[PDB]
Amino acid sequence: SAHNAYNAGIMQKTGKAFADEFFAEENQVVHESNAVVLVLMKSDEIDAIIEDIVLKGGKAKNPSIVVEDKAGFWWIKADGAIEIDAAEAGELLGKPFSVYDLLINVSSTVGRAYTLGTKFTITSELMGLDRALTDI
Amino acid sequence: SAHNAYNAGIMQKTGKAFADEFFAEENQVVHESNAVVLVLMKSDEIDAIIEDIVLKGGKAKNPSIVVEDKAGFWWIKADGAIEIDAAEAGELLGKPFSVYDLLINVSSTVGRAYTLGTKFTITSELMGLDRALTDI
Amino acid sequence: DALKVNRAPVGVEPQEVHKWLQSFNWDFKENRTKYPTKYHMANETKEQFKVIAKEYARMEAAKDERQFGTLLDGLTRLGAGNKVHPRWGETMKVISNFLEVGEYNAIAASAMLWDSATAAEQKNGYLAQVLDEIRHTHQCAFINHYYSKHYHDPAGHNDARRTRAIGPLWKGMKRVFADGFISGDAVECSVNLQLVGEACFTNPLIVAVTEWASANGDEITPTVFLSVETDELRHMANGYQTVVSIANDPASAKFLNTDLNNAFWTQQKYFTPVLGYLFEYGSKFKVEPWVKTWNRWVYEDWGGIWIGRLGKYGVESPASLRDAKRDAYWAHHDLALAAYAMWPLGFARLALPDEEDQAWFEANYPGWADHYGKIFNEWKKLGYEDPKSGFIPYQWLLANGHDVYIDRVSQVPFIPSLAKGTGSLRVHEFNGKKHSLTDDWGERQWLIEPERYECHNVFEQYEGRELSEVIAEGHGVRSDGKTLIAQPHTRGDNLWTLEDIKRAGCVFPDPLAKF
Amino acid sequence: RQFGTLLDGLTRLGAGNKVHPRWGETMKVISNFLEVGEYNAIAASAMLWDSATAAEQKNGYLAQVLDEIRHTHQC
Amino acid sequence: AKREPIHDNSIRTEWEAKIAKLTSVDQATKFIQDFRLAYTSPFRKSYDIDVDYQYIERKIEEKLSVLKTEKLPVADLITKATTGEDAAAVEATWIAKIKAAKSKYEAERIHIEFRQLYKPPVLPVNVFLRTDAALGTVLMEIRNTDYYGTPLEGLRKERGVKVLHLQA
Amino acid sequence: PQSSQVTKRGLTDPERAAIIAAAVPDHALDTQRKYHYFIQPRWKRLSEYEQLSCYAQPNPDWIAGGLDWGDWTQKFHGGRPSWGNESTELRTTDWYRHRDPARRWHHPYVKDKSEEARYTQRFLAAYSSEGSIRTIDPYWRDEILNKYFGALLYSEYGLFNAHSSVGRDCLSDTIRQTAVFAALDKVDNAQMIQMERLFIAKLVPGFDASTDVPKKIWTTDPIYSGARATVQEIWQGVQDWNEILWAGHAVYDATFGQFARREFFQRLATVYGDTLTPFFTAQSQTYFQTTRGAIDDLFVYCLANDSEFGAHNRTFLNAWTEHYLASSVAALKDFVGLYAKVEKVAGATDRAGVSEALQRVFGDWKIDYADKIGFRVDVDQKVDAVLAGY
Amino acid sequence: PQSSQVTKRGLTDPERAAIIAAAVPDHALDTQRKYHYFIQPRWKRLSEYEQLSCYAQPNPDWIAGGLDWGDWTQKFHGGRPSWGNESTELRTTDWYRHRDPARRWHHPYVKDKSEEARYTQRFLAAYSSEGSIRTIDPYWRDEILNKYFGALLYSEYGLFNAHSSVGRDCLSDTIRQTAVFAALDKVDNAQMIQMERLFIAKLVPGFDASTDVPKKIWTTDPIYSGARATVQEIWQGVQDWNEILWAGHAVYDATFGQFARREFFQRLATVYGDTLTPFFTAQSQTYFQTTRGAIDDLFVYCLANDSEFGAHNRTFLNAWTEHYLASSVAALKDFVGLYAKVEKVAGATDRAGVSEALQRVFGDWKIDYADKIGFRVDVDQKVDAVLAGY
Ligand SMILES: [Fe+3]
Ligand SMILES: [Fe+3]
Ligand SMILES: [Fe+3]
């Protein structure tokens, strides 16, 4: 879990300690990561999804999820994949809610993200290369 | 003009001075007034109408208009009648604007108010009694 | 023909359709209102707002989208729901849910008026009002729904449609804004609902309140209430069109001023003390003295611009106005005494005026400190706020001879030994039942019309029962089953429970048993 | 939702002039410079729609073409 | 008195046991008319069950209405009172009685008693509502004439109250 | 400046915000955040529709389902209660049971109708640019459409007005919403017919879009004689608010209304080259199916199966149906005389075509309504009774 | 808590709000508050449409109308400029002159289409509840509609794809908006035809809504042979972006497209009892008239009258028209063979009816487009050339 914090690892250092690590030879190439980053824009519907889907059942299925408050948006980072069922969000909210309504306040994805049925998935997997896309 | 201020007349007194006037025998019956009161809810479109219609051409045609800032709304009181042409508001705003769009942010009328064509009028006159209502 | 025609782009605007509306009605001998009435509405009345069904929806949906954007997007992202002073976020439990029943009952009242009118245009103005009051019901609900989700005390925001039934203040609200709208001559109901309730008292209740809300940190209520009133102004026009439509009916010369004066007193009897109480005692930051608000909106502007101008058509200044002015000065302070003394029966948390509130009260109402402030400061010393005190001030009033009575007509409480507003106790026995009446106008209503006014009061229903049992049976508790929704302070600790109330030994009496 | 927040709620609050001057100046540059990126992305996405052969792939680029018009107007 | 709880108490439970023993339309009609003469309106004979009579009344109406649908022919449901009287005839009778009333005190008693005796399910809904509406129109025109004429002292004597206290 | 203080906002003023922040507790005082959490949900979880609507009506415990207590505070002269059991013959264990299956509170209702409002004007401006009016049979246009379709607006307008006392008298909040939305859709239908006529007048010089001729036809032409009589009765002849809803929507409008709108004016527009009228009947028929979902819930699903009063309620529903179905069959028998005024087209306006259309209306009605409340009806018998007037 | 600072908002935090308030001057620093106040307004006052659109394209002064200067920063291998005069034969004194008369920036465009999106689903759910499909001629349904209407989606899909290079290559922001919205409406038409077919499949068991048969017909049936050839040419045969717009919308779609959509599939739906298809053609025809207003402004009002290049531009417009009108007449001559597959109805599908329909399309086109650019056309001659294939 704490590896997925916004301020993880080098980000805790300041001043010269930060500079020494940032310029170290090991950090001059990218390092492959199995993380996904999800950004959700704050709104009435999103704040309920965060509290009652992401931080309860979501974190139960994926204990690596970290959620951080960035004032206007929620920053979420997890190992592997994050999945949100719009059908479940609608039951929680008590109103019609398709996958396209969920996308009204989904603001960024660092990861492979797609829609299938009522479900929105953001995944580390290389969709269409290692695993095909399907129809309903 | 200053007779139409929110805090006109008795409203400037406090404490016992207010009480003495409020309970004076002359003030135990209503006094007929030729004023109208218009309340406009603050919004981008309304604040432009206030600045460029009500307080320029409006006050030129009716110098008795007083406008007061009540935080969430504009309180307007004038002698006789206030008229707002939605056709002129649309030219100012640069977008389609019918009389029904103007009504989105018209929040109260103390007066006889009606719609005819593109024009919204609030008037001291006893419409339908002293002056008939018409069609277009 | 089949090859030529004009091909310029044209549509049909709403006012083009509206012009044909008057001719939709048609003549048959059964075509008359089903409801009892002394008046006859003229067939040719026209309406001030030319609205048809499609344009109605277009106009209202555009208001909604802006309102729900502000709420669900912008104010939620700012966290505005919990940036409200606690006194005000508690007051909004009562304001929005009590106003809700007025919006709800106005649906049925407007429909009864649509039935009464004969002119298609006049029916159409009432019909637009019927739809609006559905909007407003859902809008008041939305306020308490939003507060339930985002404010630090959702209890009572989340269940007032059942927890309002415990307490006495709710009964008076049902008279002005529920039964007063729908039970009577259609025209008496119209003056209660439209000419007085809407054209007079919603200016303070719905418009002026938004400035108090904003002063105390609440930008949710302005967003909605200012939108509510955009529809309300069309209802003010309905009330005026009622008067226009009966103007040439000889019955109006016989009856209209009596119906108007009864309705004016009915509405003012509750709103004058209750709004002044909720504005001044349910806020931290105050905008202006309530008696000045009433003077501006009720006495000078509504009185001068509506009633004063109708003078040339036979409408008189209401005979009860002088009594109403005395209430505007003192009766909300009288009501505060009863509201604070019976705090456990409500569904909101209250705060005694603090040192700076008291200074403001005495400056704007000289004499307040020697009468009301002395009492509040004694109660504070006796432990009003402290759940281990065993102290509930309703008992203290009884111990000192300051009995509370309920007006059989208006359901407003009255404390004759302490009151500075209008009224005096009359106790009658009639056919083996005692009744308490509190002013000249409502005493006459009851004497002439006793089968209209049979409302059970809280002392009749709760006689001999202990406070905490009534509160538990009414579900007046939080989700733990034991901490009261209502509290005598707005702090986050030392909350009262059912067992703290039970320790005070408070049992309801029959106040009229001594007579 | 966006235009409600802007034209109704934030305007009634006076938010437009509650910005630190340094930042309200910076937004002159950020929003108008970003605008040209949104604008030119319309034409770029259309060139990619031309390049692709799969109808679905053309459709993803086409949705982007419309979005970048949205964003031009939003900046 | 010490009241029981509001919605579930020994008074209501006892009256429900009586009502369950009604077995015929004639018996149920007599029962509900007696109940309404005894316990409703400001001219009721007793206030003893004041806080429970309205719920109890609903339960009697329910029993009478079901017995009606089990025992009467369909056409009777539309055109007759359960007394056996012609519904249209009840209408014409009571509109005649109120238009002959000389005072507001006579008019008010006619309207109240009409409701005591014929409130649904005794009379059909449509006939009942229309009659009630015509009676109320008359009652209001009488009462609202010169409404402020009589001073309170006189109204109190006309009404017949025992004045128990008047504050000075 | 201005005469009155400019009030400082508690949200943004630094002094007031600091004071407010010091008064707000650092924890919630309760955890129950579901608004009116005690409502019994009809579906898997509480909907916003139920939350915003259910128990707004302040009924006491002596009106089945109510949560409050005691008498009303103010009643009618004579004693008539604000609301009461004497308003209808039907009975139930809980008046708050009804749910509109489309879950319309006020906002989704005007949102949807606003889309139809604005799209209609875009369609009309394009249709006039297209010149598609050139292709409509001018006899259908000026004879059937202008006069007999025009006259049908009075049937919709009378059904609308039948709801006034329903809106005052009915006994719960979800029922009142259903009824009011139904009423507005019916007056919308009346206004849309007149909008069509006014539109045609802009395109065809000397087309008369005045209501005078339609109103003469509605009031005096025998083709509408039974329709007008049933509508005058449903509106002004009764006051039981369940009778009015059931008679108006579930019998008269489901039989005569569906025949007149769909089987006659919409279906025959698509044989005489009318490309304009089916745009307008698309709306009325959509409004009819949305209203039907709600009327079905109230009467068919709930009141006809109330655990204590179902059979009781079906006695009244069956009596009502027998009476208004006869009125409606009469109305249809007068109406099918219109076919004498139109071109005979095989399978459409010949006796075989009218008989298949009547078989569609009555057979649908039997499945949608009659079978579900126990009402026995012989479809063929009703079709033959209407053909008597052909 | 969380690893990173929780940022205090400058709007509501008392400390930060106080600091900001002390930095904001007490007066405005300029009084010009009209955004891009220097745009020349087409109408009485600047519109929001012009303000948000005009000069977003950063053209330099060597592309007529541009406000910037210097070369592009990065060009194609070989030197092709980011945008350039070499993209089209037409010329003008100012590429930013064009205005869509409907003034669509992005928000009104998706607002309107969203209303049509949601209303369509409500209409389909009611239409299926109505059972109005029962009344459609099953030969028209499974033979003309499924196969030949299905195949028409490829014509709309090809017109859509013709815009890809137009969206990359055109030279101003109002033109680019017009072109992109036109493109989406054409692919919307293609998707709506397939939506209709998929809808019918839910109602009629064994109706095949797969595109296989429509695609076979589009590619191999001689009825579509000339259509497909013109569309392949307009899309992939040219790159002048003014040629593509003019050929696609003002010639091919205004002649073949209007005949196929309105005179054939919409008009004949209203003779074989099809109450479903005119709901969908109502949208395509509305989209056609909105697109026409904009194409007219660009070509007819502006480029054909440019003060310096009007006659120059009409030389190209007339040449283009001569070439694509011949292609379109050929396409129509192949298409009218479809009438051999349908029931002969007098004044509709007989030679007289087809000849009056062709007279409507070509006569309208002459007034809307041909007369306005100086193009001489003999309507009767074009009608006779098409009837050759009847
Ligand atoms: Fe309201
Ligand atoms: Fe209202
Ligand atoms: Fe972008």
Curated annotation (Swiss-Prot), chains A, B:
Domain of life: Bacteria
Keyword Iron: no
Pfam families named in the record: MmoB_DmpM
Keywords on record: Monooxygenase, Oxidoreductase
GO molecular function list: monooxygenase activity
Family annotation (NCBIfam families): MethMoxRegMmoB (NF045804)
UniProt record similarity statement: Belongs to the TmoD/XamoD family.
Function statement: The B protein acts as a regulator of electron flow through the soluble mmo complex, switching the enzyme from an oxidase to a hydroxylase in the presence of the substrate.
Protein name as annotated: Methane monooxygenase regulatory protein B
Gene from which this protein is expressed: mmoB
From Swiss-Prot, chain C:
Pfam families: Phenol_Hydrox
List of catalytic residues: C140
Residues holding Fe cation 1: E103, E133, H136
Required cofactor(s): Fe cation
Annotated GO biological process: one-carbon metabolic process
UniProt xrefs under Gene3D superfamilies: Ribonucleotide Reductase, subunit A
Function field: Responsible for the initial oxygenation of methane to methanol in methanotrophs. It also catalyzes the monohydroxylation of a variety of unactivated alkenes, alicyclic, aromatic and heterocyclic compounds.
EC number per UniProt: 1.14.13.25
Family according to the record: Belongs to the TmoA/XamoA family.
One Gene Ontology molecular-function label: methane monooxygenase [NAD(P)H] activity
Xref: CDD domains: AAMH_A (cd01057)
Cofactor binding note from Swiss-Prot or TrEMBL: Binds 2 iron ions.
Reactions catalysed: methane + NADH + O2 + H(+) = methanol + NAD(+) + H2O; methane + NADPH + O2 + H(+) = methanol + NADP(+) + H2O
SS bonds (residue pairs): none
Name the UniProt record assigns to this protein: Methane monooxygenase component A alpha chain
TM region(s), chain numbering: none
Domain of life: Bacteria
Keywords from the named record: Iron, Metal-binding, Monooxygenase, NADP, One-carbon metabolism, Oxidoreductase
Binding site for Fe cation 2: E198, E232, H235
Assembly notes: M.trichosporium has two forms of methane monooxygenase, a soluble and a membrane-bound type. The soluble type consists of four components (A to D): protein A, comprising three chains, in an alpha-2, beta-2, gamma-2 configuration, is a nonheme iron protein containing an unusual mu-hydroxo bridge structure at its active site and interacts with both oxygen and methane.
UniProtKB/Swiss-Prot annotation, chain D:
Record: residues binding Fe cation 1: E38, E68, H71
Coiled-coil regions listed in the entry: none
Active-site positions on this chain: C75
Disulphide bonds in the chain: none
Annotated family: Belongs to the TmoA/XamoA family.
Role, per record: Responsible for the initial oxygenation of methane to methanol in methanotrophs. It also catalyzes the monohydroxylation of a variety of unactivated alkenes, alicyclic, aromatic and heterocyclic compounds.
Subunit structure: M.trichosporium has two forms of methane monooxygenase, a soluble and a membrane-bound type. The soluble type consists of four components (A to D): protein A, comprising three chains, in an alpha-2, beta-2, gamma-2 configuration, is a nonheme iron protein containing an unusual mu-hydroxo bridge structure at its active site and interacts with both oxygen and methane.
Protein name, per record: Methane monooxygenase component A alpha chain
Species this chain originates from: Methylosinus trichosporium
Encoding gene, per UniProt annotation: mmoX
Part of the whole protein covered: 77 to 151 of 526
